[PDB]
Amino acid sequence: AYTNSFTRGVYYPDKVFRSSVLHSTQDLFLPFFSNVTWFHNPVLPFNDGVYFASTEKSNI
Amino acid sequence: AAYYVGYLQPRTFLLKYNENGTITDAVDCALDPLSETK
Amino acid sequence: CTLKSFTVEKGIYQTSNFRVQPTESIVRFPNITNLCPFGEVFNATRFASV
Amino acid sequence: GVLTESNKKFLPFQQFGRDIADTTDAVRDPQTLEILDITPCSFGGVSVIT
Ligand SMILES: *[C@@H]1O[C@H](CO)[C@@H](O[C@@H]2O[C@H](CO)[C@@H](O)[C@H](O)[C@H]2NC(C)=O)[C@H](O)[C@H]1NC(C)=O
Ligand SMILES: *[C@@H]1O[C@H](CO)[C@@H](O)[C@H](O)[C@H]1NC(C)=O
Ligand SMILES: *[C@@H]1O[C@H](CO)[C@@H](O)[C@H](O)[C@H]1NC(C)=O
Ligand SMILES: *[C@@H]1O[C@H](CO)[C@@H](O)[C@H](O)[C@H]1NC(C)=O
């Protein structure tokens, strides 16, 4: 169940405030336009990091 | 209920801040040659 | 003492630098927070043996 | 430097700002949520008009 990752998973690299700046950084990130596994239970390898997205209404 | 699981890789990103300090756009460096130029 | 002579021609010359020195030091650490329960240990009801 | 009151508004998780040339100018006070700026001490060259 492969799904396009689009452009998500962007998080703040550190704690600094820059205004109108195009600063570029090297860190771990979710690659753009990758494949994610649609699920509907089992154990999964953690590896280095993970982008967990959830859509639910029952908080389960 | 549904949930998606991906993985993270160490690739260089470029970020665009705004007047208030919120990330509004990001560009990968090793996706395609135009982004490599950017 | 800059132009090594006893006669100085008319003009403008640069000698040294002007600088302001600091007055004091101010260190402000984050507000205080969760203490350790040392008074629980010493003011306990009874102590165990060795 | 010379601390002073600032009109800049931070973000509620953000600690301290920077500049274009990666220089620190805006530092949040730890206890009070007031915003402080940094201005370097005055300096310059000394010249003699003779
Ligand atoms: C540590 O935090 C406490 C609580 O946030 C600060 O106490 C407040 O100080 C402001 C300053 O005007 C008052 O308006 C509040 O009424 C105070 N609240 C309480 C509960 O005391 C305290 O000032 C902080 N420490 C330092 C050194 O500033
Ligand atoms: C995602 O998987 C599909 C099907 O296997 C494949 O066609 C596509 O190229 C994959 N995308 C990436 C970025 O690997
Ligand atoms: C920054 O914050 C101000 C506060 O009201 C808001 O008006 C403005 O739209 C914000 N900037 C952006 C780019 O959203
Ligand atoms: C035990 O209680 C007394 C009574 O207030 C107090 O004076 C003393 O400091 C306490 N002991 C410790 C270790 O705090």
Swiss-Prot record, chain B:
Where does the record say carbohydrate is attached? 20
Chain intervals for the UniProt region annotation (Putative superantigen): 18-38
Q: What does this protein do?
A: Attaches the virion to the cell membrane by interacting with host receptor, initiating the infection. The major receptor is host ACE2. When S2/S2' has been cleaved, binding to the receptor triggers direct fusion at the cell membrane. When S2/S2' has not been cleaved, binding to the receptor results in internalization of the virus by endocytosis using host TFRC and GRM2 and leading to fusion of the virion membrane with the host endosomal membrane. Alternatively, may use NRP1/NRP2 and integrin as entry receptors.
Q: How does it assemble?
A: Binds to host ACE2. RBD also interacts with the N-linked glycan on 'Asn-90' of ACE2. Cleavage of S generates a polybasic C-terminal sequence on S1 that binds to host Neuropilin-1 (NRP1) and Neuropilin-2 (NRP2) receptors. Interacts with host integrin alpha-5/beta-1 (ITGA5:ITGB1) and with ACE2 in complex with integrin alpha-5/beta-1 (ITGA5:ITGB1). May interact via cytoplasmic c-terminus with M protein. May interact (via N-terminus) with host bilirubin and biliverdin, thereby preventing antibody binding to the SARS-CoV-2 spike NTD via an allosteric mechanism.
The molecule here is called Spike protein S1
- What's the source species for this entry? Severe acute respiratory syndrome coronavirus 2 (2019-nCoV)
Q: What is the lineage of its organism?
A: Viruses, Riboviria, Orthornavirae, Pisuviricota, Pisoniviricetes
